[PDB]
Amino acid sequence: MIPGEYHVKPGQIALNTGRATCRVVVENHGDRPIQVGSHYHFAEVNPALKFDRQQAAGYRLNIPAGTAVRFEPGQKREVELVAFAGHRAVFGFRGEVMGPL
Amino acid sequence: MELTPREKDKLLLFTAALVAERRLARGLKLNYPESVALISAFIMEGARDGKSVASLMEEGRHVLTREQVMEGVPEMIPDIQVEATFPDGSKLVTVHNPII
Amino acid sequence: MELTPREKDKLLLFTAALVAERRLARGLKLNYPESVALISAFIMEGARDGKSVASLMEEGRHVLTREQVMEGVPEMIPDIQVEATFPDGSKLVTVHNPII
Amino acid sequence: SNISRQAYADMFGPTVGDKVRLADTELWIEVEDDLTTYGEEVKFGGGKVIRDGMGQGQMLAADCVDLVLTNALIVDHWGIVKADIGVKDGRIFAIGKAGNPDIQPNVTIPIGAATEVIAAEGKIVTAGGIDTHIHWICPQQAEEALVSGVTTMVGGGTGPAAGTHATTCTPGPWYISRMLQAADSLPVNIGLLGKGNVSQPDALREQVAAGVIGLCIHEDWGATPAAIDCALTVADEMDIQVALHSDTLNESGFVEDTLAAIGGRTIHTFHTEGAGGGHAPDIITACAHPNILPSSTNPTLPYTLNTIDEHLDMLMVCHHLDPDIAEDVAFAESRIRRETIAAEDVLHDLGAFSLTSSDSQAMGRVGEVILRTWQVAHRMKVQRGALAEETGDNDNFRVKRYIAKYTINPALTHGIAHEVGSIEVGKLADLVVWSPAFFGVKPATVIKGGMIAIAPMGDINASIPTPQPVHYRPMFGALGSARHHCRLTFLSQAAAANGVAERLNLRSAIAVVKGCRTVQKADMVHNSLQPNITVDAQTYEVRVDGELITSEPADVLPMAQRYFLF
Amino acid sequence: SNISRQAYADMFGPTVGDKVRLADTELWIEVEDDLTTYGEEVKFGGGKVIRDGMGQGQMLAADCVDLVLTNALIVDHWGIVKADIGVKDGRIFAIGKAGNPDIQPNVTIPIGAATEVIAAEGKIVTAGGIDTHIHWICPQQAEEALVSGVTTMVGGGTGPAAGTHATTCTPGPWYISRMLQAADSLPVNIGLLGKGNVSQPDALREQVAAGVIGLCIHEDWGATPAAIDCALTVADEMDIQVALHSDTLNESGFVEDTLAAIGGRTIHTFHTEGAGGGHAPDIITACAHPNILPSSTNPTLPYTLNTIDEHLDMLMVCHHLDPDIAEDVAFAESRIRRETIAAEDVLHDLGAFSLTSSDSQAMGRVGEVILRTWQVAHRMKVQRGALAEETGDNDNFRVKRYIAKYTINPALTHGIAHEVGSIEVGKLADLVVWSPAFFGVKPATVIKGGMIAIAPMGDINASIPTPQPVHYRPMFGALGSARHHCRLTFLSQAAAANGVAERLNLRSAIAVVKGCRTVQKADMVHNSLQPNITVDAQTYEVRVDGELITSEPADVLPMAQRYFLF
Amino acid sequence: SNISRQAYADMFGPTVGDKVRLADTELWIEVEDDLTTYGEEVKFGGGKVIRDGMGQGQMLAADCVDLVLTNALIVDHWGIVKADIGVKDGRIFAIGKAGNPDIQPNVTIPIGAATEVIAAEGKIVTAGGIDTHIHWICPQQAEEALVSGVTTMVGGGTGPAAGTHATTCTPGPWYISRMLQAADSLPVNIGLLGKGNVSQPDALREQVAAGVIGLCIHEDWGATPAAIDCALTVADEMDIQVALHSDTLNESGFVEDTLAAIGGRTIHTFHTEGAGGGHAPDIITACAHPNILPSSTNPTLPYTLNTIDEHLDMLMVCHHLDPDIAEDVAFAESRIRRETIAAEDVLHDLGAFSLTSSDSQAMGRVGEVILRTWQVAHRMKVQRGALAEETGDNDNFRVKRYIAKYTINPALTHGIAHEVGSIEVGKLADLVVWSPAFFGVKPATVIKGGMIAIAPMGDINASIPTPQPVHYRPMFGALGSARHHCRLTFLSQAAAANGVAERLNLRSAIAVVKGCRTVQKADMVHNSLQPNITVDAQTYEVRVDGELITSEPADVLPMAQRYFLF
Ligand code: NI
Ligand code: NI
Ligand code: NI
Ligand code: NI
Ligand code: NI
Ligand code: NI
């Protein structure tokens, strides 16, 4: 007996289903590490990350909400993006869009 | 003495620990509050003696064993934290999974 | 620990009982508050051990005798009451004429 | 991407189909629904979702909630569902999907710069309890009750005085005014009951006009047919509730005469089992009538090994009875009966008894109304198994039936259900957050009117709120004017119209009671059974449809020795 | 029918002719009268008298009292009688026979639906003490004093500051205003004293117009003939009291010069014995004059084995004296004299000293004014026997003489006797209920303005208010606006007329002092002796009519080790 | 006559040329000036100077101070001098020579009947500390901070909620209003910070109009260039301060990008060393710019033996980080760096870091801001010796530089320096009196707005305030309306003009912040160094002008085990 214990049923959860996604190769060209969040507009991440910014337009990382992806200096890896929804209006970040799209 | 609010608060932890200490001596299996109180006071005295944070983080896991506390209690305490005045000022001691 | 107001209040009864306990040990005849505090803490520990209400109502009358308390004290205490968490929850223990 | 169910539960709390044990009981709840869009959950923290342009929008205050309880597992009379809770203006704004509409789908609860966050993932959220049987013997009961999860207190008294010790009555205009003022200092919602034992209607109307939300008829002040009829007559015209503690001595008649005087009019019978007061030994039969809203006081919940031994002396002290006076002790065995004590537990399980209360410091424990309701549910599952209404392999229905006993049912019975009682939009945000290991015993957070009023807090000078010693301390919701803004003083409609709040210069929010004469047994959520119950005048045996009703005394219970220091 | 006297006493408390021991002293009181009609006593409880149509009537609120203290044994300067006490609008309504005129005879105190009940049978009821020598060194003294049974506090101070540590003075308009506001938070009646040491009348008038009810002349601020005369001149025109702590150093003259400056005008001399301050060593001779209202501070009451040893260091700390400075220590033996310390006890017994006070945290104990007055009475009975005024085999007269020392006499001296000081109709209901075993030591209930302010209370979550631990906790009468409504802030007539209460926005009830210039030694109830007392300049011996006055030091006292934990 | 210097110091405290050790540290202060006229010092007591016609004059209230702190040794950013302090209307009236102009020479601070006295001879007087990094996790922090000597608290929060646990933000109008009201109950000066992470200016303006005196940008809510720029734009137009806790993850850019978004506009960078948050690992380089007002949080002050071990787990709890999630733990070693931790101590000693704060219950200790600032000063003197600015054989300059870190510099940075921050005429009388043996650790008296708010107090029923147990208890300055009159609620100019105080019905005094956009590094008293500092991206080494900056970890510190019970 364990007070307040969970009895989670076995299986898996499919995240962000029914949404456009794309893979992108990203390379950290900075001298310090960089870490990106799940809902951050990818096309506006730290300028030291080299990748096709044009493709990541309106996308965010296809990872469980709240988690993050790290890039050590000089690191290169392929990440999967998922398209923003709702009104698809970006406000904030580095302020490159500040409106719909 | 000029006892500040925090020094008086700790007198509460100390007194709670006296209750647990006597009960364990009678040979009872300790409950949730009794456990936390007992291990927490252990650590405070550790700092008073001048033991380092690192030493106590380890010793804190050998105060009570799974066979000395009630069922479910070890899982009810994922870690224990208490601050005390060490020779080099106030420091935080975190003991992860104290009861095994 | 998550100590509620009532658990903290009992830490008062416990500490009051430590004072009486030491005094009786020196061989002093206990006074009014010292007596109540000492017998009251006896009962609480009784419940912690898991003794029944009925057993304690009896044992409570054999903690202190008329020759261990100050004059007039036994008549100043027609009964003693304290509640504690027994295995089957909170219960009230009433000890009538505890000192004889 | 994809995530395993276990990792998912550790991160955002359990989802549909997962089960959770309640504290250390045998009760298991199973999530019935989840209102989230998988992958779009909101989480607060460094690099998490609730950050500008992401899970936080650009809308102004008016367009977003003030508080969001993220990933909460709600347990209410209406469901056991996973959702985010939105709070605006101290009231429940919505139960849905929190986030930013600019980038997330299905957001029904907007998060903006003005939104504070309470991370409820892995916690169980419930409405605040409502104790309708308070003896105002001391102000210290409010803190005690609040720490246990009871956010509303109805009762009567003036302090430690013989009248109050014995009865829930705030006698007359002066004491009512005085208690109404003193109430602004207490961190819980309050409503007062006046003394209703009078055969002169005007003496009652005054008290109602003075501010009381009900009248308590107590045998210590004379629960005669004349008095009962008089109180119910005024209640009918002023829209207030009557709480009854009948004639135990059968001095003016038996239970059936009391039932006759009531005349099928709405009334809330206190401690219907009888141990706390009422016609000996069959006051329990009242639970069979459509106009009676029956409740129990907690000392008899649940039937255990020490219950009887304890009760013999608890009786005397309360009602100023003399252990030497034969007559004052003779009715002890007629008052405390093992047969009715055991039957009561079952009658709750069946829905025949609809409420639970304390009977604070007069045969009941103020901080144990929630704790004992669950100990009963546990014991009944253990002895009788699944209820006929259960579906699936969980105790979900039994949990809704028992949680309604100290939340919504008490709210309906006293005419305050329009303001509190459950987690429904528009209601005052009186919420309690619990860690599953401490459900029903010690809360993680207690929210009043939209602000945290009390919570466990560690070392004040510590670098984090978690180091020891950890104990309940008052928070901002319990301070000065913030408290006034987060609590309600319930008035009667007459008192409200007479300007009693302006004249007494009350600083708290005001709420008016209504619909006390129209509620009936059939309205009590999940607890509307009107059983054909009989009680044997001699053997004291309780029978429902001829079948014997009874249960066995527990030697050990959960939510007891594992959680308390004393 | 018929009932034996013993059973009668157990049921309704003692009656005419019965005697009761006060705590563990040698003092015995005997009931002088009983106002009840045998068989028609009112008792509260199940099946008792105070029930609808029986001991409770049908009258409206306006026609019945708010509170009734049933079967109380009153001890007051005017009698030791058995009666019921009626309370209405926070004031003493009547002392008579409570009940229902419809069915009972001689009912002078009506009980209705609006009447709360306090069962006082077997208890002793007294008025609240009044301490006229408070040093406001900390707010914590009010709770301490209240628990002991002192409901009114007069004194001065601003907090723990050198000026206040040494003197009872609230210096100037700003500090007075600040302390008047802070007072609303305290659960006792308060009146402030300003600094009266100034030879410029306008500097005093301001303080009086600012709100003080008196002026304290203290040697630490300069108790010169000029200052004394100036303060008494303003007092005469503003109707305020002057409290004096004379020139111990004889710097400006001896005691006879101080007496000369006073000029036969009304004045209250603080600690007239001298140990607490005043002309060394004969300030005690002042008790012989018609215009001097003399009082004692409690550390010297009564003369005991450890009194002298203790006092030597207690002196220094208080008045910031230096133990190394010869001059600061030389006047120690001139200040503390065994001869005057022993004589003081006798002078109280004779009625030459009319008041008792504490001198809180500056050579006196705030929670021991009542306790020590009785310890003196005990010791004096033990050593000198019956007073010449006694009648019958009881200590009744000695009890009235000593109880008046901390109740009515302090009330007359400061011009507040019209509001408090004794149990008389129209006075504020500041009452203290005691169990005979704890009389003078620990109260059963302490009532302020008609509401219980503090009382011993047991476990809050207990099923009854009696389980342990039992200790004093604040009740409703001590909360927010209810407290404001049950306490008085005494103002000077000028302050009242200037609208000081409206300008400072004081929330409590206001009372004005009056008749401070017209009281004299002959007005002090039971304590009006003006003895021909002399003091030997060298030997320090005190003589009254040439006969030597003295008493022996006690090794053990009652109301001590049997009641306290520390 | 003549008196030896030693006897003189024992009597009136040290004078010019005398040195005094601070607690048990190696720091020694030397009196630089004395404002008295030898032989004309004022002393309170029996036969002392402050008596009518002597050291006390005949002037009316308007012509004399309300309070005088006699013979005080002031330690302030401007000097370490001996003088009397005059207090009038809750404000500092003068720093000079107290007495009576009628008979004494050079009296600049008049003493009259309305003057209270605090004997400060032999004590050290300082202004009250100001903590600009408060997380309102609980109201209990105010008492804790007050007892340590901090009279002003700036920060944000709503209580124990995830948002507040992690950030100093009071989100939106409702929570701001609620916290503004709750603040009237707290005995310290308060100013709130709102959530500034929004790319929509109107959402910020509302919060400012609602009452906040600043906006906190926190990475947990998204510290992106857009958000930063938006907050600074509004700050520029509303005259409020912005407190920054940058992007530790370098998610939107490195430190130089944050610096770019700021655009040379005024900003206060929180915990500039980095351990508490900010761009890893070089957020420390910000202390080199003219527009950055840098401060440190106390857990890293000073570098000691257990600092690193402790910090690893302290990180997680605060910002709701998961020890299992690789990403949430990976940035632990990037956050906590021994190299920057040691360098910070030196950077303070040089004046490159201008403030010290706590970061209460989110990686910092509320009652240790003063204590730790001095422990650093001690350690730096021990390791680096005399500063280049020292003159004479004392640590005077190092003491002024370090005392300014928690007094005046925090006051300038947040625009409240016109009301508090130092001991200068016209400023609120927020003073702290210390015994030299307990300097920086436990105060003798803590004065708020002219009244003692908290002080160590002994047995309440004792004959003097000194018997044990002695512990801090609330005084009159902390009670009801007196408290309201002695504390300030800081509002923004917009909030003040909108009538927010009248609408929320705030009872305390109001003060408006101004000059937050015009302060710069060069304005920070004694701490204006803009060093050419670099940080090695890999080795994390800190270099100033190419030279390596570092210090050694202490194994033992003063103001620790000798003063505390736990
Ligand atoms: Ni009842
Ligand atoms: Ni009841
Ligand atoms: Ni005096
Ligand atoms: Ni005095
Ligand atoms: Ni931060
Ligand atoms: Ni912080």
For residue E319, indicate whether it is catalytic.
yes
Q: Please check whether residue E204 touches F, CB under 8 A.
A: yes
- E168 CA → ligand 4 middle, Å: 6
Q: What is the CATH number of the domain that holds A83?
A: 2.10.150.10
For D556, name the nearest residue in chain C, comparing CA atoms only.
C88
Note the Cα D183 to chain centre separation in Å.
Answer: 18
Q: Is the dihedral of CA F438, F442, F444, F447 positive or negative?
A: positive
User: DSSP letter string over D487-555?
Assistant: -EEEE-HHHHHTTHHHHTT--SEEEE---TTT--GGGSTT------EEE-TTT--EEETTEE---PPBS
Closest CA to F170 of F190, F195, F196: F195
* Whether the Cβ atoms of residue D435 and residue D158 lie closer than 8 Å to each other: no
Cβ-Cβ contacts under 8 Å for E5 (sequence gap 6 or more): E15, E18
Neighbours of D328 (CB within 10 A): 19
Q: What is the 3-state secondary structure (H, E, C) of B10-69?
A: HHHHHHHHHHHHHHHHHCCCECHHHHHHHHHHHHHHHHHHCCCHHHHHHHHHHCCCHHHE
What is the total residue count of chain F?
566
Cα dist from A42 to A35, A60, A81, D398, F300, whole Å: 11, 5, 8, 48, 35
Buried b (16+ CB within 10 A) or exposed e, F538-565: eebbbbbeeeebbbebbeebbbbbebbe
Gap between the terminal Cα atoms of chain C: 39
Catalytic residue among D77, D135, D319, D378: D319
Q: Is the dihedral of CA E480, E484, E485, E487 positive or negative?
A: positive
CA distance C81 to E462: 10
Nearest by CB to residue C48, choosing from B12, B23, B32, is B23
Residues of F in contact with A92 (CB under 8 A): 199, 222, 224, 226-227
User: DSSP letter string over D120-140?
Assistant: -TT-EEEEPEEEEEEE-S-TT
Residue F457 to chain A, least CA–CA distance (Å):
45
F449: helix, coil or strand?
A: coil
* The one-letter amino acid at F562: R
A26: helix, coil or strand?
A: strand
CB contact under 8 A, F222 and D51: yes
Cβ-Cβ contacts under 8 Å for F106 (sequence gap 6 or more): F37, F40, F96, F97
* The one-letter amino acid at F461: N
Nearest by CB to residue B89, choosing from F470, F560, F566, is F560
Residues of chain A in Cβ contact (below 8 Å) with chain D: 1-17, 35-41, 60, 62-66, 68, 80, 82, 84-93
In chain F, count H helices and then E strands: 17, 27
Structure tokens at A55: 């493709």
Structural domain boundaries, residue C40: 1-100
Alpha-helical (H) ranges within F64-161 are 141-148
CA distance D18 to D32: 9
The residue written with tokens 């008089």 in the block is D230
Q: What is the 3-state secondary structure (H, E, C) of D421-439?
A: CCCCCCCECCEEEECHHHC
CA distance A65 to F68: 62
Closest CA to E88 of E109, E106, E59: E109
* Whether the Cβ atoms of residue D296 and residue D405 lie closer than 8 Å to each other: no
CA distance F361 to D458: 9
CA distance F313 to B54: 12
Chains E and A touch (3+ CB pairs under 8 A): no
Closest CA to E375 of E345, E347, E395, E405: E345
User: DSSP letter string over D446-463?
Assistant: EEETTEEEEEEE--TTSS
Closest CA to F299 of F238, F357, F377, F386: F357
- D506 CA → ligand 2 middle, Å: 27
In degrees, rounded to 5, the angle at the alpha carbon of residue F21 between the alpha carbons of residues F20 and F26 is 145
Q: Which helix (H) or strand (E) holds D374?
A: helix D369-384
CA distance D178 to A101: 63
Q: Which residues of F are catalytically annotated?
A: 319
Closest CA to F491 of F517, F509, F505: F509
For F335, name the nearest residue in chain A, comparing CA atoms only.
A33
E79: helix, coil or strand?
A: strand
Closest CA to E66 of E480, E477, E451, E424: E451
CA distance D126 to D73: 9
* Whether the Cβ atoms of residue D25 and residue D378 lie closer than 8 Å to each other: yes
CA distance E193 to E494: 14
CB contact under 8 A, B2 and F442: yes
φ, ψ at D90 (rounded to 5°): 80, 5
Structure tokens at C71: 């004059």
CB contact under 8 A, A67 and F325: yes
CA distance B22 to C21: 14
Residues of B in contact with F314 (CB under 8 A): 92, 94
In degrees, rounded to 5, the angle at the alpha carbon of residue B67 between the alpha carbons of residues B61 and B72 is 85
Q: Which helix (H) or strand (E) holds D193?
A: strand D189-195
Structure tokens at D294: 């029956």
Nearest by CB to residue C8, choosing from D148, D471, D554, is D471
In degrees, rounded to 5, the angle at the alpha carbon of residue D97 between the alpha carbons of residues D91 and D98 is 70
Catalytic residue among E319, E348, E414, E526: E319
* Whether the Cβ atoms of residue D116 and residue D67 lie closer than 8 Å to each other: yes
CA distance D416 to D408: 9
What is the Cα gyration radius of chain D? 24
Q: Is the dihedral of CA D168, D174, D176, D179 positive or negative?
A: negative
Residue D101 to chain A, least CA–CA distance (Å):
5
Note the Cα E143 to chain centre separation in Å.
Answer: 15
Q: How crowded is the C-beta side of E151, counted as CA atoms within 13 Å?
A: 35
For F54, name the nearest residue in chain E, comparing CA atoms only.
E222
- E135 CA → ligand 4 middle, Å: 7
CA distance D72 to D84: 6
Closest CA to D276 of D239, D307, D305, D252: D307
- D44 CA → ligand 5 middle, Å: 15
**Beta strand spans in F423-487 (E):** 431-434, 445-448, 451-457, 471-474
Residues of E in contact with C86 (CB under 8 A): none
Structure tokens at E62: 């306006």
Q: Is the dihedral of CA D33, D38, D40, D42 positive or negative?
A: positive
Question: F449: left (phi > 0), else alpha (psi -120 to 50), else beta?
Answer: left
Closest CA to B69 of B39, B95, B99, B44: B99
Nearest by CB to residue D140, choosing from E54, E118, E460, is E460
Note the Cα F466 to chain centre separation in Å.
Answer: 29
Strands F67-76 vs F116-119: parallel, antiparallel or unpaired:
parallel
CA distance D342 to D302: 8
CA distance E408 to D363: 42
What is the Cα gyration radius of chain F? 24
CA distance D438 to D371: 10
Closest CA to D437 of D168, D122, D31, D58: D122
**Which ligand number lies closest to the CA of residue F135?**
6
Q: Which helix (H) or strand (E) holds E447?
A: strand E445-448
* The one-letter amino acid at A74: G
* Whether the Cβ atoms of residue C64 and residue C20 lie closer than 8 Å to each other: no
* Whether the Cβ atoms of residue D25 and residue A31 lie closer than 8 Å to each other: no
F551: helix, coil or strand?
A: coil
CB contact under 8 A, D113 and F195: yes
Give the DSSP letter of residue E80: E
Strands D91-96 vs D150-156: parallel, antiparallel or unpaired:
unpaired
Expressed in Å, this structure's resolution amounts to 2.5
- Which of C6, C8, C11, C13 is the best mutation test for B, with the most CBs of B within 10 A? C11
Structure tokens at D58: 């650009």
CB contact under 8 A, A91 and D53: yes
* Residues around the ion ligand 2 (C-beta < 5 A): D 359, 362
* Whether the Cβ atoms of residue D224 and residue D249 lie closer than 8 Å to each other: no
Nearest by CB to residue F477, choosing from E159, E200, E504, is E159
* The one-letter amino acid at F563: Y
Closest CA to F170 of F134, F130, F141, F145: F134
Cα dist from F144 to B4, F147, F186, F363, F453, whole Å: 7, 5, 11, 16, 13
Q: What is the CATH number of the domain that holds C55?
A: 3.30.280.10
F82: helix, coil or strand?
A: strand
Q: Which helix (H) or strand (E) holds D344?
A: helix D338-350
Structure tokens at F437: 């043996």
* Whether the Cβ atoms of residue B31 and residue D561 lie closer than 8 Å to each other: yes
- Which of C83, C86, C91, C96 is the best mutation test for E, with the most CBs of E within 10 A? C83
CA dihedral D6, D11, D15, D19 (to 10 degrees): 60
Structure tokens at D17: 């189909």
Peptide bond into D281 cis (omega under 30): yes
CA distance F59 to E152: 33
Domains of chain E in start order, with CATH, are 1-127+422-479 (2.30.40.10), 128-421+480-566 (3.20.20.140)
What is the Cα gyration radius of chain B? 13
What is the Cα gyration radius of chain C? 13
Task: For chain F, list the contacting chains (3+ Cβ pairs, <8 Å).
Answer: A, B, D, E
- Which of D562, D563, D564 is the best mutation test for B, with the most CBs of B within 10 A? D562
* The one-letter amino acid at E34: D
Q: At what angle do helices F225-238 and F255-262 cross, to 10 degrees?
A: 30
* Whether the Cβ atoms of residue E354 and residue E528 lie closer than 8 Å to each other: yes
Alpha-helical (H) ranges within E200-306 are 201-210, 225-238, 255-262
Q: How many domains does chain C have?
A: 1
